[PDB]
Amino acid sequence: FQQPKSAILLILGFASGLPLALTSGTLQAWMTVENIDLKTIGFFSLVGQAYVFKFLWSPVMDRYTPPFLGRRRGWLVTTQILLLIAIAAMGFLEPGTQLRWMAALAVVIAFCSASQDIVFDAWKTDVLPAEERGTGAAISVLGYRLGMLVSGGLALWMADKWLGWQGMYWLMAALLVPCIIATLLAPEPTLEQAVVAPLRDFFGRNNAWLILLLIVLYKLGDAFAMSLTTTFLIRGVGFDAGEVGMVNKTLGLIATIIGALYGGVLMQRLSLFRALLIFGILQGVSNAGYWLLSITDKHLMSMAVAVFFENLCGGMGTAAFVALLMTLCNKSFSATQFALLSALSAVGRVYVGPIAGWFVEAHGWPTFYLFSVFAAVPGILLLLICRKTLEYTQQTESFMMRRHFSGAYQFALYLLLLGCLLLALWLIMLALNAIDYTSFSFLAGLLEVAALIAIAGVLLGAILDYLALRR
Numbered sequence: 001f002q003q004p005k006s007a008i009l010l011i012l013g014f015a016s017g018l019p020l021a022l023t024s025g026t027l028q029a030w031m032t033v034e035n036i037d038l039k040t041i042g043f044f045s046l047v048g049q050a051y052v053f054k055f056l057w058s059p060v061m062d063r064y065t066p067p068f069l070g071r072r073r074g075w076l077v078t079t080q081i082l083l084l085i086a087i088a089a090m091g092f093l094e095p096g097t098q099l100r101w102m103a104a105l106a107v108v109i110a111f112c113s114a115s116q117d118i119v120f121d122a123w124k125t126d127v128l129p130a131e132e133r134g135t136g137a138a139i140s141v142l143g144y145r146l147g148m149l150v151s152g153g154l155a156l157w158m159a160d161k162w163l164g165w166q167g168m169y170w171l172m173a174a175l176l177v178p179c180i181i182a183t184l185l186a187p188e189p190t191l192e193q194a195v196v197a198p199l200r201d202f203f204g205r206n207n208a209w210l211i212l213l214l215i216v217l218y219k220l221g222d223a224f225a226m227s228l229t230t231t232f233l234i235r236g237v238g239f240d241a242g243e244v245g246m247v248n249k250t251l252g253l254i255a256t257i258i259g260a261l262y263g264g265v266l267m268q269r270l271s272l273f274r275a276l277l278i279f280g281i282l283q284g285v286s287n288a289g290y291w292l293l294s295i296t297d298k299h300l301m302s303m304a305v306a307v308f309f310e311n312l313c314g315g316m317g318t319a320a321f322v323a324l325l326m327t328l329c330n331k332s333f334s335a336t337q338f339a340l341l342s343a344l345s346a347v348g349r350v351y352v353g354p355i356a357g358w359f360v361e362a363h364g365w366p367t368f369y370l371f372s373v374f375a376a377v378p379g380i381l382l383l384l385i386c387r388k389t390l391e392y393t394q395q396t397e398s399f400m401m402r403r404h405f406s407g408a409y410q411f412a413l414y415l416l417l418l419g420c421l422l423l424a425l426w427l428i429m430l431a432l433n434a435i436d437y438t439s440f441s442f443l444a445g446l447l448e449v450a451a452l453i454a455i456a457g458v459l460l461g462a463i464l465d466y467l468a469l470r471r
Contacts, residue, residue, distance in 0.1 A: 001135070005127070008186045009136045010143035012076070012120055015179035017147025018172055019083050019113035022090070023106050024048050025230050025249060026155050030165050032231040033241070034095035041231050042357020044103065050110035051117070052346035055339055058118050059191040070188040072123040077183050079115040084176040086112060091169035126189045145257065149250050150175070156245025197333055198340040206400035206469065207389050209462035211328055214382050215341055216348030218280060218321055221376020222314045223352040225287045225369070228360060229310075232290070236365050238297045247300070248307045255308040256315030263319020273383070273390050276324055279317030280380045286313035287372035294366040321345075327393040389469065404471050406464035412457055419454020422447065 024045070031041050066074050086109045093102040120140075128136050151172065159168040202212070233244040267275050289306040325345075329337035359368045383390075392398065406412050426447045432438045 005186075006136075006139060008182050009124075009139045010146070011178055011182035012123075012186070013140040013143030014147040014150070015076075015080055015083075015176065015182070016113070016117045016120055017144040018151045018176065018179075019087065019109055019116065020051065021148050021151035021155065021249070022087060022169065022172060023050075023110045023113065025152055025245070026159075026165075026168065027090075027102075027106055028228075028230045029156055029159075029234060029244065031095055031099075032234045033165065036095055036099065038228070038231065038235075038360045039354075039357040040099070042228065042353050042355070042360075044106065045227060045353030045356065046350065047103070047106045047110045048353075049346070049350055050107065050114045052343045052349065054114040054118055055195055055343045056191075057115060058122075058339075059194050061115070061118055061122065062190070072119060072126060073183065073186065073188040075119040076116065076123065077180055079112040079119060080176060080180045080183060082112040083109060083116065084173050084180065087169050087176065088173035091166045091173075123186075123189065145253055149253050152253065153246040153250030156242050156249070159245075160242035193333070194336050195340065198337045201330060201333070201337065201399070202328075202341070202344075204399075204401050204403065206402055206404075206465070207328075207386070208403070208465055209458050210382070210386050210389060210465045210469075212344075213458070213462055214379065214386050215321075215325070215328075215345045216379075217382055218276070218324075218376075218379035219318075219345065220348060220352065220379055221280075221283055221287050221372050222317070223349045224356055224375045225290060225310065225372045226314075227352060227356045228368075229290070232294070232365060232369075233303055237293050237303070239300045239303045243300070244303075247304050251304060252307045252311045255311035256318070259312040259315035259317075260319050262312075263316040263323075266316075267319065267323060272320070272323055272327065272394060273387055276317075276320045276383055276390075277380065279313065279320040280376060280383060282313040283317045284373050284376040284380065286310050287369060287376065290369040290372065291366050294364075294369055324390075327390070327397075330399065385466065402471070404468040406461065406468055409464075412461035412464055416454040416457025416461070419450055419457065422450055422454065 024047075028041055028044060031044065061075055062071065067078055068074050069077065086105055090102060090105050090109065093105065095102060124136065124140060155168045155172070158171065159165045162168055162171075202208070205211070229248060230244055233248050234240050239247070263279070270278065286309055289309060293302055293306060322342075325338050325341045328341060329335075356368070359371065363371075392400075403409075426444075429440055429443065429447075432440055433443065
């Protein structure tokens with residue numbers, strides 16, 4: 001509905017979808033077209049973690065002083081004006097000779113773009129009454145989807161009309177001028193509660209790691225898929241050079257929206273377990289077909305059909321994941337667990353990036369996607385294991401706080417506690433190879449073995465849930 005507080009929800013939402021594709025899809029397509037190797041492309045999926053560690057910064061924008069303006073109006077300009085510079089300065093840097101400055105800029109793009117969504121979400125919650133909520137939320141998501149396709153298919157195709165990839169990022173700076181103008185045209189309106197408290201409930205529940213792995217491992221197939229999909233459709237098969245964006249993304253986005261609606265339509269007649277399983281199994285067969293393109297290039301329509309089906313069985317299953325997330329949040333502090341669980345669901349998406357790139361080199365393009373169909377099985381296989389623990393949520397909404405102590409819990413978590421610090425400790429070793437300050441020939445030897453041991457602590461910890469679910 002057209003009203004003075006309607007266009008802002010679309011343009012401001014357009015300011016949130018534009019940078020999301022630029023740090024993930026177009027940058028990947030920028031590296032793919034510029035002959036940047038597959039392994040480094042997968043490492044660039046890590047800069048997408050800024051959108052999933054946004055839960056930490058959400059308290060920050062409130063406690064930290066509002067710069068130059070109100071807390072909600074001013075901070076949105078700050079992340080928009082930073083992006084208008086960051087996106088433009090990104091186009092100044094050329095893949096090939098200069099990636100580290102481009103990579104560092106991508107993180108700042110990622111850091112500010114997630115700040116763009118956080119401040120807008122804070123603005124979307126203060127300005128939207130319950131009566132008008134959803135009406136503006138649908139409008140906001142519509143602009144986000146429009147911004148995704150403008151920075152997705154429209155950006156990639158504009159990169160072929162443009163004599164180079166420089167202009168497409170430069171035009172995003174030009175297209176972000178209305179975003180700031182919309183921000184200043186709009187009349188202006190905790191870490192413990194938002195972050196610390198939800199972890200206690202998720203870690204105090206009897207399900208604990210069984211739901212945690214089920215939350216994480218479910219979209220593993222869709223995480224190994226997608227990801228390098230833009231590189232694949234560009235560097236793998238003849239449907240190359242820009243048509244990927246207008247088909248893999250433009251039709252891919254439409255596939256998710258129609259699928260997500262179907263994920264809210266058939267869920268009425270489908271049990272949550274019977275919906276998560278059927279959509280997850282269909283999610284597994286959805287990844288099949290990416291192997292079909294990787295074998296023989298029959299035609300473009302093979303990508304167009306599969307991209308629809310890939311997102312259809314994924315986006316519709318995404319609604320099943322969203323429904324599952326909603327059944328695991330208490331009414332006491334709902335809408336924060338969903339933010340935390342979805343963000344913490346992407347803790348498992350972190351490992352996908354480097355493994356996605358590393359797998360494609362050693363093992364061929366068909367093998368990685370034939371691995372994807374088996375990659376979603378652990379999410380499904382755990383769902384069948386977690387069938388009983390999802391039944392209590394459907395029957396009577398409650399949480400079992402009895403952890404039983406998991407036998408000897410110090411053998412479960414405290415074993416993996418060092419592993420959490422090991423990622424930061426490994427990052428200290430990461431600078432060593434770049435700057436040659438300290439010689440450690442071990443390098444990644446300790447990171448690989450102990451991280452699985454750290455995961456094994458979750459694995460044996462999740463093993464403790466099933467044996468302790470008897471009591």
